[PDB]
Ligand binder design. Structure first.
Ligand SMILES: CC(C)CCC[C@@H](C)[C@H]1CC[C@H]2[C@@H]3CC=C4C[C@@H](OC(=O)CCC(=O)O)CC[C@]4(C)[C@H]3CC[C@]12C
Ligand SMILES: CC(C)CCC[C@@H](C)[C@H]1CC[C@H]2[C@@H]3CC=C4C[C@@H](OC(=O)CCC(=O)O)CC[C@]4(C)[C@H]3CC[C@]12C
Ligand SMILES: CC(C)CCC[C@@H](C)[C@H]1CC[C@H]2[C@@H]3CC=C4C[C@@H](OC(=O)CCC(=O)O)CC[C@]4(C)[C@H]3CC[C@]12C
Ligand SMILES: CC(C)CCC[C@@H](C)[C@H]1CC[C@H]2[C@@H]3CC=C4C[C@@H](OC(=O)CCC(=O)O)CC[C@]4(C)[C@H]3CC[C@]12C
Ligand SMILES: CC(C)CCC[C@@H](C)[C@H]1CC[C@H]2[C@@H]3CC=C4C[C@@H](OC(=O)CCC(=O)O)CC[C@]4(C)[C@H]3CC[C@]12C
Ligand SMILES: CC(C)CCC[C@@H](C)[C@H]1CC[C@H]2[C@@H]3CC=C4C[C@@H](OC(=O)CCC(=O)O)CC[C@]4(C)[C@H]3CC[C@]12C
Ligand SMILES: CC(C)CCC[C@@H](C)[C@H]1CC[C@H]2[C@@H]3CC=C4C[C@@H](OC(=O)CCC(=O)O)CC[C@]4(C)[C@H]3CC[C@]12C
Ligand SMILES: CC(C)CCC[C@@H](C)[C@H]1CC[C@H]2[C@@H]3CC=C4C[C@@H](OC(=O)CCC(=O)O)CC[C@]4(C)[C@H]3CC[C@]12C
Ligand SMILES: NC(=O)n1c(O)c(C(=O)c2cccs2)c2cc(Cl)ccc21
Ligand SMILES: NC(=O)n1c(O)c(C(=O)c2cccs2)c2cc(Cl)ccc21
Lengths: 691, 693
């Protein structure tokens, strides 16, 4: 049974009954600049994770699986680079570049062993919007893709520079702020953006490159205004590949019995399309938009153009943050599995270096794609050597084998990108779940979706995270303040309007604020305390001071005798600039009596009656205070003590006491003897003091 | 003494021992029929609230209020006429329209306002916001006397849009916007606006010409445009500005200190404006010297103009900032005078009144404004008992506009700027707050510093928006890394404190209490998991995976026929590939084995499992105020694997509403049962002890 026989403490008889322990900028500087040989070796190994895991290789049990997974992820990466390379309005030659240099750099500089870094559609569309904005903001057939590619390379370089700076500054906790509901809404909006943007390729039309605000609907108009100019054969083949891909995806997620190495319809039907393209000559018999001739070889590096460095400096921050968040989220699952310690700052540094290399070598920025990582992990990728195999596959397909991939319809790629989107868009079935879950996460999801579909894929994210930060204030703007009273005549206190056996001590009003008290709700806390208490202490003090002034005036006139309050037998309204004297503390030392303003009072003088001798502010749920809240609480406690009703604060810990000490909050009036351990011992001390 | 003899409760034997109450109605779908319930008394109350004039006009004590109100009205009227055509220079418009901004808002607020101690008009912060907005409008508009006309038209339109926004906000009853403006941010923004005033009045204190600049870095651009042409200043105008500045400051401080035997505050402002006008008319500053005298005042008002739609679209961003700053300044100024004299000011009514006043002023060729701090202070100090003083100020402005314009025409237009700089002493004194805040919170000081920097660089509207965003981020900053600790008993009673704080620290065997002194939401669930794992001492998922691997190897050996079950009689490394490792996270079931192996005492040969020392843990959630979907999911996963590794989990310090909220989260199921919540830490520990033995 629950039996306690301890004395009553007041947070100031406690420290004097139990001794404390030691509580000890130059402190951190010395321990941060302490150079050591072992520390240098550790930091070098961390900055170069390759040396950490290359020696610890179990070849005879890892090599075959890694090779198979590497070939699979390489074929998927070559299929995906020149598909995501179309969301950016650049030739698909450079898409393969974006899937090789980041992989090679991440081999050396990365920690995760189950991600295949490359381009993914969300970042590809971010880069496309950024490059369109750059080309539109730049002061003055084959004359457009050149500047598009140059601007894309520069924007990728700047995104990589931002990522590298963030990694160097060791601010890797940025991925914390994005959360889960916001990432789900942003993911759904980006999926819708993919669906809208791929229409211009699924229909084989020409669309002007729109930028930033209302990007989807502008593209929607530019696509739907020219339906009569589509190509029927291209639409038919894209449709047929779409339905067959969906059907086999269903038949693959189902029938998962005796089906090793699930059938890769992506590559299979891209091969089928390339074959029928070389066979029946869609370019001659029909009019299609086949991928252009692939030049054999890389391209010389180009210096990052400075003119577009300044123009896009806004969108590159969003690109870098989205890339880092996607990479961290994708690698989080594969680090939770297989139990290895992924490092966020190291991941940021690796991704930044990869983006610098890719942008310098005429590619575009990217990070590990969800589907590519999934296929790499499922195929048996034991480490990043699978990423190396994918990189060398991309290298050989760039250098030698390009003519077989040249006759690709360039719209089957768009439909394939639209293909793996069912699980990408299934998150739409979450508004209903979140409506009955929190009623705030659903709001944040809806606002995120609206902002990312109206403001665009860019500034929409910033507005979404700003609204996310505002949502915390929304949650704590109006705390459900209540009144507490005893239950069962023991040390249990609950809400007054919740139980039938409620018992309240005489003249004691317990107030609890179940939310942190900061700047945005100190006024609401004061109003709720006012309502729960039932009167305004400032009003009571003002009326008492007015009555005392009238009494003193009568005594000076010579109508009241002090021994009492015997009377032998003019409302003086006060002007401005002098009413402030009514807020002064009540002192009656000049009067020999001890009038309490409770029993009675001399003639024709009225003072509101009082029924409170104490109140207890429960601060168990209060987690922090700021300057505004401290000032408001000090004023509240000040006139509460001034109207001669004691105040007590309970449920606070030693660090909270220490923080409140350095606030100029304690003085001769608001003493430090007001803090108590629990509610019950405060009530007990209250009863002992009263009688 | 503290004596308690209650039974041990578990938040589920408590509800079954004490009956609850009704709680029979919701607050979302049934909230109607009380808001749309039309009633006669409700209609009278709402009409009285929407027209506060009828509330306090009948309740007038003339014989004790009229003389004081008249005196305060004359004083505030002379100050308002002195201030309108002074703040009218911050906007690049003729100072004739400045008097308009101090008359129509006052007249409208007379009818529509709740506060009885504010004199609504133009104030420098909003005047500069309107100036920046109108400069942006004139710069973004597609195509001597030809410039101020479009400037005035665009200023009137931007004022109209600000008033429309304020009226819409008041109608929507969102008057709680003002509480997103923490005192630290408001102080930083006030100081930055003071610096902006000081810089922007230089072009008039020096009598130069400066191109109108807009938004990003608008102080340093004006600083360059001013400092590039020092040689073009007028020495006489500079000399009179400096002498007036020093004397006004000196006598203002004399008024501050020598208040004893000082009947009525010193009229220095008006007295010296009169002196300057007199000497200007006398020595002919325009002829003998070259000055920038206020131009001739045309007698009469101006016909109303339609609000230009072309500039409606361009400035729609800056007008939100203008409206919010105006409403915040009005509410903050009236807050002091409502705390005094104890009357119930209504924020929505104030918003509606200010919006209507701004609409009228903008339609009648004025510019937006709200009650100025100094004007309100002088109106209150002079004895303003109600808004009839505001009416007297308004009629004073009317008569000075209509009749006496030639008297005020020969004003140097630089003494006005110096007077504007003179009062800036108290406004700029707030710079002595970074030091106070650095030793107070170390976060409010950061808010102040970032607010000042953002308002200096980004401008006024964009600076305020970015400052508010950073202020909102500061909450996450405060709760990003909670100071999580470990709790243990003190004195063998129901007192639990931090483990690293006392010498008599007693911890129960095999019980680890964890407390998170901050709300657990999306931005610290990972940190909470890391801290909990570190305090516990092991990874529960790692322990589960190793136990499952050992059990799989044991089952393989038993199938091969090497281990006998009856007790674990024995005789004499299969790495798992991907897409199948997920079987290691399954719950441990040994029903197929007759024994009850616990993975503590020992284990068959050549099989290693990490030892364990925890049989329960108590998560203190007294300080946890709220959870979201992400935190609920993370907590559910954590409790899931903790229960799966066969160590009980208990949560204490939570209230009935928190239990109710957590119930509708899909958080309780056959594994994470509802019997895990306890009242306090001590009864949880006691139940732990009773269950163990
Ligand atoms: C959910 C809400 C509160 C978020 C904020 C929404 C605004 C930022 C959006 C909604 C309407 C949008 C506008 C709708 C229409 C257009 C027209 C568009 O003009 C053109 O493309 C050319 C038109 C022409 O040449 O006639 C430029 C963007 C703009 C102003 C949009 C800019 C972004 C706006 C203001
Ligand atoms: C706020 C959310 C919930 C609703 C979003 C609706 C609007 C913000 C969208 C829907 C249709 C959009 C419009 C569709 C077509 C046009 C025309 C389009 O092209 C031109 O004006 C170019 C000239 C020409 O086409 O001849 C420019 C964008 C605009 C105004 C779009 C602006 C934004 C609009 C109004
Ligand atoms: C806190 C995070 C968001 C980073 C810090 C703020 C950046 C967003 C700022 C700080 C430095 C700024 C740069 C400082 C100097 C310049 C040169 C400046 O040169 C011009 O071209 C001037 C003419 C013009 O662009 O109007 C253009 C803006 C730019 C690139 C600025 C772009 C915005 C930057 C990167
Ligand atoms: C806030 C911290 C954690 C990250 C810091 C990274 C960025 C804020 C830096 C890194 C690279 C910088 C850019 C590098 C190069 C330039 C080009 C520079 O333009 C010129 O030199 C123009 C010369 C001319 O016009 O003659 C303007 C600044 C800018 C955009 C810089 C702006 C600031 C950037 C984006
Ligand atoms: C505390 C920090 C993180 C806040 C963010 C700072 C930026 C938003 C500021 C800092 C530097 C500023 C820039 C400094 C210089 C200029 C040049 C200025 O160009 C001109 O006025 C014309 C110059 C010419 O004609 O040569 C335009 C604004 C701009 C780009 C400024 C835009 C706003 C910037 C990027
Ligand atoms: C971030 C904080 C802590 C420091 C703020 C410093 C800069 C943001 C300021 C200081 C000086 C400013 C510059 C001072 C002078 C100029 C020239 C000025 O005029 C022109 O370029 C017009 C052409 C001409 O004057 O001939 C435009 C603004 C600019 C670039 C200013 C841009 C903003 C600057 C770099
Ligand atoms: C969010 C809630 C609480 C407040 C709503 C207030 C504003 C968002 C509204 C009120 C007045 C509106 C403005 C009223 C008039 C116009 C002019 C209008 O322009 C035209 O009609 C152009 C016609 C043409 O070009 O032929 C464009 C919208 C705009 C700026 C409106 C934009 C939306 C405003 C600012
Ligand atoms: C939540 C708060 C901040 C108010 C709601 C968002 C507003 C900031 C949005 C919603 C409606 C928007 C307006 C809707 C329609 C138009 C017409 C549009 O017409 C054009 O001139 C198109 C060409 C162009 O400006 O690029 C200009 C923007 C404007 C005024 C928008 C300005 C921004 C507004 C007021
Ligand atoms: N697994 C696999 O091989 N693939 C995919 O998942 C594709 C997608 O649709 C993606 C959407 C978001 C990331 S990938 C895809 C597209 C092409 Cl062109 C070729 C192969 C592809
Ligand atoms: N009290 C008073 O009479 N005055 C002031 O405080 C003036 C200011 O400088 C203000 C700065 C911010 C609000 S007012 C002022 C200016 C003039 Cl032109 C005439 C009188 C004035």
């Amino acid at each position: 049974q629950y039996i306690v026989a301890r004395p009553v403490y007041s947070t100031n008889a406690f420290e004097e009954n139990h001794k404390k322990t030691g509580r000890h900028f130059l402190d951190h500087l010395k321990v941060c600049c302490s150079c050591s040989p072992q520390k240098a070796k550790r930091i070098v190994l961390s900055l170069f994770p390759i040396a950490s895991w290359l020696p610890a290789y179990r070849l005879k049990e890892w090599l075959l699986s890694d090779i198979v997974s590497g070939i699979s992820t390489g074929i998927v990466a070559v299929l995906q680079g020149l598909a995501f390379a179309l969301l950016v309005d650049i030739p698909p030659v450079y898409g393969l570049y974006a899937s090789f240099f980041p992989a090679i750099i991440y081999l050396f500089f990365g920690t995760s062993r189950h991600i295949s870094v490359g381009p993914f559609p969300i970042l590809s569309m971010m880069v496309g919007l950024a490059v369109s904005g750059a080309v539109s903001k730049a002061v003055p057939l084959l004359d457009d893709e050149r500047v598009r590619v140059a601007a894309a390379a520069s924007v990728t370089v700047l995104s990589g520079i931002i990522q590298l700076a963030f990694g160097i500054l060791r601010i890797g906790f940025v991925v914390i702020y994005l959360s889960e509901s916001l990432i789900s809404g942003f993911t759904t909006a980006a999926a819708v953006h993919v669906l809208v943007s791929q229409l211009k390729f699924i229909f084989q039309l020409t669309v002007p490159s729109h930028t930033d605000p209302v990007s989807i609907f502008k593209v929607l108009y530019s696509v739907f205004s020219q339906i009569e100019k589509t190509n029927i054969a291209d639409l038919v083949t894209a449709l047929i590949v779409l339905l067959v891909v969906s059907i086999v995806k269903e038949i693959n997620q189902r029938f998962k019995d005796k089906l090793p190495v699930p059938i890769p319809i992506e590559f299979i039907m891209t091969v089928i399309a390339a074959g029928v393209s070389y066979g029946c000559d869609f370019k001659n018999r029909f009019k299609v938009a086949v991928v252009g001739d692939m030049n054999p070889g890389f391209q010389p590096p180009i210096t990052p153009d400075v003119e577009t460095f300044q123009n896009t400096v806004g969108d590159c921050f969003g690109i870098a943050m989205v890339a880092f968040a996607v990479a961290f989220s994708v690698a989080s699952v594969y680090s939770l599995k297989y139990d290895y310690p992924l490092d966020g700052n190291q991941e940021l540094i690796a991704l930044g270096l990869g983006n610098i290399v890719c942008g310098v070598f005429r590619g575009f920025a990217g990070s590990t794609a969800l589907s590519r990582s999934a296929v790499q992990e499922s195929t048996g990728g034991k480490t990043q050597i699978a990423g190396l195999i994918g990189a060398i596959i991309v290298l050989i397909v760039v250098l030698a084998i390009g003519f077989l991939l040249a006759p690709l319809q360039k719209s089957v790629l768009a439909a394939l990108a639209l293909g793996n989107l069912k699980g990408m868009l299934m998150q739409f079935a979450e508004i209903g779940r979140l409506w009955r879950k929190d009623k705030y996460d659903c709001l944040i999801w809806i606002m995120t979706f609206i902002f990312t579909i109206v403001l665009g894929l860019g500034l929409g994210l910033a507005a979404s995270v700003a609204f996310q930060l505002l949502t915390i204030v929304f949650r704590t703007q109006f705390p459900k303040c209540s009144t507490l009273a005893n239950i069962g005549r023991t040390n249990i206190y609950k809400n007054k309007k919740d139980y039938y056996d409620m018992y309240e001590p005489e003249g004691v009003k317990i107030f609890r604020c179940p939310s942190p008290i900061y700047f945005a709700n100190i006024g609401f806390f004061r109003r709720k305390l006012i309502d729960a208490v039932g009167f305004s202490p400032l009003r009571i003090l003002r009326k008492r001071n007015k009555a005392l002034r009238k009494i003193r005036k009568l005594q000076k006139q010579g109508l009241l005798q002090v021994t009492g309050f015997i009377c032998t037998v003019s409302d003086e309204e006060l002007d401005n600039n002098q009413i402030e004297v009514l807020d002064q503390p009540i002192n009656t030392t000049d009067l020999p009596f001890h009038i309490d303003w409770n029993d009675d009072l001399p003639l024709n003088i009225e003072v509101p009656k009082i029924s409170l001798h104490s109140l207890i502010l429960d601060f168990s749920a209060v987690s922090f205070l700021d300057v505004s809240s401290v000032r408001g609480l000090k004023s509240i406690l000040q006139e509460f003590i001034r109207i001669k009703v004691d105040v007590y604060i309970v449920g606070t810990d030693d660090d909270f006491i220490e923080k409140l000490n350095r606030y100029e909050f304690f003085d001769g009036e608001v003493k430090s003897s007001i803090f108590f351990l629990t509610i019950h011992d405060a009530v007990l001390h209250i009863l002992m003091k009263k009688d």
